[PDB]
Amino acid sequence: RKIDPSRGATLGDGTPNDNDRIEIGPTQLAFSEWAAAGLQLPNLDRMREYRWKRLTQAIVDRGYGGLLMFDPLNIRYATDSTNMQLWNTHNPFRAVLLCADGYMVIWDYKNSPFLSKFNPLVREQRSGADLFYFDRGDKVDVQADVFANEVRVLMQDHAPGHTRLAVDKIMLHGLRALEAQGFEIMEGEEVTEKTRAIKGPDEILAMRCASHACETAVAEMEKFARAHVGDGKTSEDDIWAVLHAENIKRGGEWIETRLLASGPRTNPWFQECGPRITQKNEIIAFDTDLIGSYGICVDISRTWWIGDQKPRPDMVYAMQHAHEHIMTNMEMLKPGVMIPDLTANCHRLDDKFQAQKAGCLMHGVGLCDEWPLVAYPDKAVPGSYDYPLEPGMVLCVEAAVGEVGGDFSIKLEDQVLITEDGYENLTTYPFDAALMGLA
Amino acid sequence: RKIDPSRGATLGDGTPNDNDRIEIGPTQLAFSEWAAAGLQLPNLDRMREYRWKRLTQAIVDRGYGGLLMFDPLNIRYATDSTNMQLWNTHNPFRAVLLCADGYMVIWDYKNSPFLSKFNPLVREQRSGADLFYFDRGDKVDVQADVFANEVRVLMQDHAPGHTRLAVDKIMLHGLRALEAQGFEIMEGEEVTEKTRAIKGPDEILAMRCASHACETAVAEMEKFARAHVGDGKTSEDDIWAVLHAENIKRGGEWIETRLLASGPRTNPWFQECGPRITQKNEIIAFDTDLIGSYGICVDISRTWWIGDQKPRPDMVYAMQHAHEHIMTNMEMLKPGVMIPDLTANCHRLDDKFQAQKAGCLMHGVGLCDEWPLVAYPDKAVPGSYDYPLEPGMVLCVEAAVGEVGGDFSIKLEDQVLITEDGYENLTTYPFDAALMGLA
Ligand SMILES: [Fe+3]
Ligand SMILES: [Fe+3]
Ligand SMILES: [Fe+3]
Ligand SMILES: [Fe+3]
Secondary structure (H helix, E strand, C coil): CCCCCCCCCECCCCCECCCCCCCCCCCHHHHHHHHHHCCCCCCHHHHHHHHHHHHHHHHHHCCCCEEEECCHHHHHHHHCCCCCHHHHHHCCCCEEEEECCCCEEEECCCCCHHHHCCCCCCCEEECCCCCCHHHHHHHHHHHHHHHHHHHHHHHHHHCCCCCEEEECCCCHHHHHHHHHCCCEEEEHHHHHHHHHCCCCHHHHHHHHHHHHHHHHHHHHHHHHHHHHCCCCCCEHHHHHHHHHHHHHHCCCCEECCCCEEEHHHHCCCCCCCCCCECCCCEEEEEECCEECHHHCEECCEEEEEECCCCCCHHHHHHHHHHHHHHHHHHCCCCCCCEHHHHHHHCCCCCHHHHCCCCCCCEEEECCCEEEEEECCCCCCCCCCCCCECCCCCEEEEEEEECCCCCCCCEEEEEEEEECCCCEEECCCCCCCCCCCCCC | CCCCCCCCCECCCCCECCCCCCCCCCCHHHHHHHHHCCCCCCCHHHHHHHHHHHHHHHHHHCCCCEEEECCHHHHHHHHCCCCCHHHHHHCCCCEEEEECCCCEEEECCCCCHHHHCCCCCCCEEECCCCCCHHHHHHHHHHHHHHHHHHHHHHHHHHCCCCCEEEECCCCHHHHHHHHHCCCEEEEHHHHHHHHHCCCCHHHHHHHHHHHHHHHHHHHHHHHHHHHHCCCCCCEHHHHHHHHHHHHHHCCCCEECCCCEEEHHHHCCCCCCCCCCECCCCEEEEEECCEECHHHCEECCEEEEEECCCCCCHHHHHHHHHHHHHHHHHHCCCCCCCEHHHHHHCCCCCCHHHHCCCCCCCEEEECCCEEEEEECCCCCCCCCCCCCECCCCCEEEEEEEEECCCCCCEEEEEEEEEECCCCEEECCCCCCCCCCCCCC
């Protein structure tokens, strides 16, 4: 029973054309819009092989025996398998071990070993890596030793002679149990972040699709906002709810922040989306921070003016300054540029906007916000990110622009791929004409 | 400028009646529905004080000097302050120290110290507790020592003589830095889970509101499903998206899982909500797993039959058996009953449903799934939860009922309060009359 009657045994991404399959993914709505937009689809099998090969090599390059992952985003990277991702983020029930020979094992939720079976690179599905008080109460320690012994045996068989085990993050009972087994615990995030920083061809294709779906969802939200803002009942939450639904309808997964705000709640930036009733002749600013189709993060920001009056002149200047900030900074991007040189040479925001500027001028992005973080000169730490940009990295380029004690802020941000030659702005979403000083 | 013209300086929960305030919360939509339903609103101030006093007492009772929290759900319990909750769950940028004398400090996101200022119990807003590779690269270790020295000084001043410091979960760099300051690191979750297990009166009021908002959101989803399932395009994701949007519109926060499935995808249970095109004359089953209004978790499950035909007799039996399971198990609940006695005396599912039954027959709930976990007899571990039920505990009571290799499952679950001399089922959502064999 096909989900897409117009295709053969597989969908355009190589997955089975089967309405009843376990595996989820983009909806027919999403696939339809991508085809209309002329987008080439990723091949998921080749994508999954690329990530696994790259992560395996990262382990080998460091002389480690294995990498043990409890962060659901790292688990997603290694296996492309989801399972209650958001519950998993703060309940560590799940683990993946990847050994130096490429052998990969998942410890999954006891009731659902079938969820990663679609990926043959996952060689075993086990259970019992859930080492936290809710799940095991006063008997965490017993299972921690069972689990740590399993990891020892796997490492003995698939990484013999290696005692170095990289771990991204683990509960203290698990840490103690692994150390008891003889492991020297290495920093797993140094491995995962640097590995994930370079996207293969299929990941870039997935991201193009995710970017399109997100921009479409945002367009629905803009449509809702311009039609309903100022009707005396429409709140920030009402507007933001459109983005939630439109993302989910296209096979997206969640939203990381609550960064949509209206009017004076845009300054200081990082106030959260809430019940505030929106008003005519006001700024609405937001940051998608969105985990979208194929599980790819799309992290873009736009600021809107909605009203019958024109925006104030200080608003227009702020918007122009913000847009100038990200376009100038984006021009720095090409392979071989050292991250601290991005910091040293970035566009300078006016004195009045310096106190409230964003936490970085750029950061990586893939399955969520990722390494590197490109700090502004006054916050940058020498020796923290001494590495060059490379083709296949993706960076979001940020501008947060507002005065201390001001009654609005501008937030703009684009998602940019590093190419062989330089860069490609993936983001095609319009900038507000009125705020840009146009008409 | 009031957000509610009909009230004075405060809203019904005692928060400022101010459309432009920083603090978020339930929307006017939610408040209106609750007022119409005759629900008493929580007093947030009294609620926050209750939690803080109880958490401090927990630290004192154990002979600890303090509790350091990086889990966003624990931070929300201690402070009632949110900040990019979902981003926070897998990016540990945030921390709260609560000392034995009740002194409480938050290290927040550098750019947003203002987010917890509404709670005067939070005595200081700092920054620099973000000890992970994305945020600090190769210089995590330097700040980890800065942060650990700060914790030492606070503990010297507010818990003199104490070397025991409970920690829920911390990055390894943080762990080593704290231990280097002379702290003995204790299990923080044992403190937070047992503290959070007893709800004060305002928390229970808050939960009654969240439950009502959730059931309203679910009713919208049921209306959408019964109207649109079987139209040849409506997908699981389309249906589920209604729950997302209606939650956000009422001031809810997120959904923890993807547990909605249609038809044969309901068996085995734990398949994820996806692109599947729904069909007339099929089961749809779901678990809300919802973080709702006031940040209260509402975790209920229902199973629907949608179609012009009657459900099969085995579907009716399974549904009635599931309903019998949770009503029988619920009837065991009262103060003083020992958790392992719930396990020992629980309703027995038929043999053919035993393999695929849920991971527990009950579990606690508050800001999310919480201690205790009441396991079925064949999984229960002696000595893991040797504790009695107490008034103020809230337990979800569930049933997953499906045969190995079967083409459907039933999922039912209600949310139940322990009272002074028994229990009160908080959940009023209907059971499908056709599946119950009543229609
Ligand atoms: Fe962002
Ligand atoms: Fe960003
Ligand atoms: Fe649940
Ligand atoms: Fe549950």
